[PDB]
Amino acid sequence: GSSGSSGRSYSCPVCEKSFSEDRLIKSHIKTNHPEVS
């Protein structure tokens, strides 16, 4: 059968801060942790 509905939250790989969207954690990694991306 076909897949159901989905949605997820995220946590920083460097400082463990929570985020609600993939674009927001990527913006945080780019601004606060660029040498760790």
Nearest to 25, CA basis, from 15, 1, 5, 4: 15
For Zn ion, the closer CB: 2 or 37 = 37
Q: Counting contacts by CB under 5 A, is residue 19 touching Zn ion? A: no
Neighbours of 31 (CB within 10 A): 8
Q: Which amino acid is at 26?
A: K
**Contact call for residue 24 and Zn ion (CB under 5 A):** no
Residue 15 marked as a ligand binder: yes
Residue ranges binding Zn ion (CB under 5 A): 12, 14-15
Q: Which residues are annotated as a binding site for Zn(2+)?
A: 12, 15, 28, 33
